[PDB]
Amino acid sequence: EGTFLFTSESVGEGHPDKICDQISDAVLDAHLQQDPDAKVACETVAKTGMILLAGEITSRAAVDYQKVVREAVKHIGYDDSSKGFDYKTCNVLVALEQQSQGLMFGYATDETEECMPLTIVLAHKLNAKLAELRRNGTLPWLRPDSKTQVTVQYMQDRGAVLPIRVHTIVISVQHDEEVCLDEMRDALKEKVIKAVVPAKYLDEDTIYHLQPSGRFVIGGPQGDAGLTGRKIIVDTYGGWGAHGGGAFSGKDYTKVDRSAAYAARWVAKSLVKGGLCRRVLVQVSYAIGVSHPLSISIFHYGTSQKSERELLEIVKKNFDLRPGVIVRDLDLKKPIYQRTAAYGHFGRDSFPWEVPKKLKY
Amino acid sequence: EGTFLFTSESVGEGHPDKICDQISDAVLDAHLQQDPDAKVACETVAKTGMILLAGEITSRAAVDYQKVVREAVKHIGYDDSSKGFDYKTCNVLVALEQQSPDIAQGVHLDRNEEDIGAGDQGLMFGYATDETEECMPLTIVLAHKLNAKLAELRRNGTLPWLRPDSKTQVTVQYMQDRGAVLPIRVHTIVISVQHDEEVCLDEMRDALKEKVIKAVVPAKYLDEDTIYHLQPSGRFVIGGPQGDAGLTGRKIIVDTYGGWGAHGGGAFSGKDYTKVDRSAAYAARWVAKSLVKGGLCRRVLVQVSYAIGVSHPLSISIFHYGTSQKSERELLEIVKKNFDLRPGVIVRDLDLKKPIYQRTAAYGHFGRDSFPWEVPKKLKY
Amino acid sequence: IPNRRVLVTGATGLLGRAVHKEFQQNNWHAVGCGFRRARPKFEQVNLLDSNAVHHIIHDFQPHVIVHCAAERRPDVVENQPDAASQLNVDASGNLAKEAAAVGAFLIYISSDYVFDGTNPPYREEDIPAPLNLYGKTKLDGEKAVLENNLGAAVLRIPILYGEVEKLEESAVTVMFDKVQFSNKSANMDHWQQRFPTHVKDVATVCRQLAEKRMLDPSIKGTFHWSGNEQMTKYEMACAIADAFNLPSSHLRPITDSPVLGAQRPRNAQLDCSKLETLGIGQRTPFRIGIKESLWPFLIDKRWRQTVFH
Ligand SMILES: Nc1ncnc2c1ncn2[C@@H]1O[C@H](CO)[C@@H](O)[C@H]1O
Ligand SMILES: [Mg+2]
């Protein structure tokens, strides 16, 4: 018809690129509890039995990197060398160097409850639901490394996009060598997909690509090396929206690449929830010599009856987007970043930048 | 009246994140000169005095990782303590395992080349736009040519106080036109760059503006209100890996379309055709370029997606930004009738076994001379 | 970079864009100019500024100069007469002065509104008698051009359409929204007779003419061109509907003269023998040209015309 497809992906906690993202924010948290003004940029590298930490910090806090890196790798669930990785046996190398413009986007959309694109929220939630069924016990043959992809059929319409139906579903998730190939795919359909993707989107026509690799016993750092900031699109608007380049995890609030991304998202999620537009992209151009944005462009995809002129005006009343103000409002010194480092940054109720400001205009 | 700013940045050969993209790609080329069917997922890491390779190579090649890595760093130009890093004396660590056997028997073993499955899942995009001959967005294009020029003149001699590490940001002022974009003027330009100790700002700034910018950015986009920010916060010899970390595949927006169109998270460098993160991302670009040139759309966004072990991609979608007279369904139907986007086919169309990837690891992978994927296909329909 | 040089004023505008392009892509060195917003594609000039004009003529040495810029909207002329006269007539003058003072072939674009439409079809040497002020300003141009340049060419041209960027650029292209909104009923003029003419055709005649004059110095004086499909503003709207497979029913055809329409010429049709004789001219079918010119303003396309997905 006038319809189209759009694929987004997501990865579980155990995925080695995301392992690193978490450990990087873990280190950032360790410092913030002791020094809220600590300035941090921590790359984490993961491979067969090795966690390496890299890059400059400036802080008062003294931090047991052994402890941080291991208690994180345990929480993720790498506990035996039967799985490729173990918080108990792995090498931890440290190589930190410790003393004592900008263009960002925010996007929001009415297509789901969380104001995120359906595709990525189902991708995210499929993985979260595996983590659940591994941790509670109900699927004991799972291991921590996973990846979901969720292609949705859409319906362009007066600006905004309506999810008609779920076209294709990929799940690949690391397993043990006891369970047969069948029991898994069957369980992925009934225990996992069924539990996540709303009954109304599925049908006979939907496609399932479940463990399409055959075997997936070798995984985590062992199968593929892992580096911090290698899932920026998983971390944000999974294919949708727009991206500057700023990887978040491991950086602290003094890098606007991280801070302003949350501000720009906050600003967006305000506007959709506040009725001012169904879909929206907030371009925020920061300048060298100007602590305020030089320019804000608001593409509302014709989903509003208020002009872009207007919306820009509602923002300059309701918001204050110099870094120094955003650290205050969103409270970005709180050591809470490790909970952002998997299952997406934008789209969960918990966070400061996901509670839509009441727009007085 | 509906006009906007946009900025794309670019980094140069010796920015840590782009030394890793480079070295990783240099290790890929090493293996392809010997075993064109090498499986390679090389990831480089670069901090103070270190180059660490980490990953999975499987190939009949026999490769001197020390020699390869250092020749790359040498080429980049780090060769003295004074400069912040040196090829002759840096630490090189090699943590390179084989390819997971599970992946190989899920992807390419026991299969005819053509019927090989995707080297892993994910999404790729292809962008194209009429705003420039090169068919890329002007911001990223200029951004790159500024960093390219610096090198040219550092390397050719004509400004030999320069050093590898650089970062250019180009801000352009645009207009919309029935879906297309129109570069109107250059609003702002920024050029941080590394230098040696025996030059004054006022002489560099003078050089940056008249020998580089003026000879890269066409006079027509420049005016007396265009801002220039040459050597913005002063002196710069803390550069390269010094006081740093640097990872392969962290400058992907810069490697691609400078923040235009879309990206699906695929790091390109240090990978072979079987990893669709790259090959399909080129195929995507080839597709979209062939549609702008072909003359059907004026700018277009393409999306493919694969799943591990599966040759025929799972989704293909076109967004022509309201710029073609044909529907998006009509373009999709052309793309199917003219392209074939399995990796076993793409490897052949875009000749992706040739050891020339290291070229790509700077100055962007698109809009560039001689690349297979940049030569549009003539289309039947 | 070709030998022959041509200047195209009002190249920012609908008609000038096409002339610049036709000349350029048929092996001329072509320079466009306009104040409106020429940059980055064109040179910026205020046509009323004597030196601004003189400068870029004496620094460019053009053999043909095509003059498209002017106040074209008939209503705006009667709102701001001090200016409309200054740009349509005076600029034309200064341009014609500097034109022959550089041995250059001025082609002054003119208009069928120099006639009253009471006895069509009108020939080149018929007696002008405008009914409105725009009518008269295009005419006073023709004087100011011929009095300051024997051997300049006047080229009279009807209502224009073509590949616009904004529907207002042509009085043809504006009706488009009124044709697509099949729900809202909309009136249309069925009285005044028109001859839509594609600007890419006009640009063709403009080049064709200029080239012959490069050989034959007898090519000069006044010429008519026009597309020969005769339509009302209503009949246009239904060919546009049909060209795009749209219902034209919500269109009511009003057949009375508009309440300003004793001062709008009924059928000021042009006879293009003079040109047809020399074998000049292109006539793209309305049914085609208008479909080429309007598909970017189809609503469904228009919706998808954003910067990002
Ligand atoms: N054998 C396999 N089958 C499917 N997916 C895998 C396999 N091994 C690793 N992966 C996932 O894909 C990525 C590398 O292709 C890894 O990060 C991991 O998350
Ligand atoms: Mg990647």
Coordinates of C-alpha atoms in Angstrom, one line a residue, chain B residues 6 175-176 178-179 183-184 220 222 259-262 299 301 320-328, chain C residues 36-37 39-41 163-166 244 291-293 295-297 301-302 304-309:
Chain B
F6 CA 23.8 21.5 10.1
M175 CA 17.4 25.5 2.6
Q176 CA 14.7 22.9 1.9
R178 CA 10.6 19.9 -2.3
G179 CA 12.4 17.3 -0.1
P183 CA 23.6 24.3 0.7
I184 CA 23.4 28.1 0.9
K220 CA 30.9 30.8 -3.6
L222 CA 32.3 31.7 1.7
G259 CA 25.1 12.8 10.7
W260 CA 22.8 12.9 7.7
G261 CA 20.4 10.1 6.7
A262 CA 20.8 7.3 9.2
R299 CA 18.0 12.4 -2.3
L301 CA 17.5 6.9 2.3
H320 CA 13.0 9.1 -1.2
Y321 CA 12.2 12.2 1.0
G322 CA 9.4 13.2 -1.4
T323 CA 11.9 13.8 -4.2
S324 CA 11.0 11.2 -6.9
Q325 CA 8.0 11.3 -9.2
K326 CA 7.8 7.5 -8.7
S327 CA 6.4 6.0 -5.4
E328 CA 8.7 4.4 -2.9
Chain C
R36 CA 16.2 38.2 -4.5
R37 CA 18.7 35.6 -3.2
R39 CA 23.9 33.3 -3.9
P40 CA 25.2 30.6 -4.1
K41 CA 24.0 29.7 -7.5
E163 CA 9.0 23.6 -12.9
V164 CA 8.4 25.9 -10.0
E165 CA 9.8 25.7 -6.4
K166 CA 6.7 27.5 -4.9
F244 CA -2.7 13.7 -12.4
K291 CA 2.7 17.0 -15.0
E292 CA 6.5 17.5 -15.1
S293 CA 6.0 20.8 -13.3
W295 CA 4.3 16.3 -9.1
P296 CA 6.6 17.7 -6.3
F297 CA 3.5 19.5 -4.9
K301 CA 4.8 13.6 -1.9
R302 CA 4.6 16.9 -0.1
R304 CA 7.3 13.1 2.9
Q305 CA 9.4 16.2 2.1
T306 CA 11.1 16.5 5.4
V307 CA 14.8 16.5 6.3
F308 CA 14.9 13.2 8.2
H309 CA 13.0 10.0 8.3

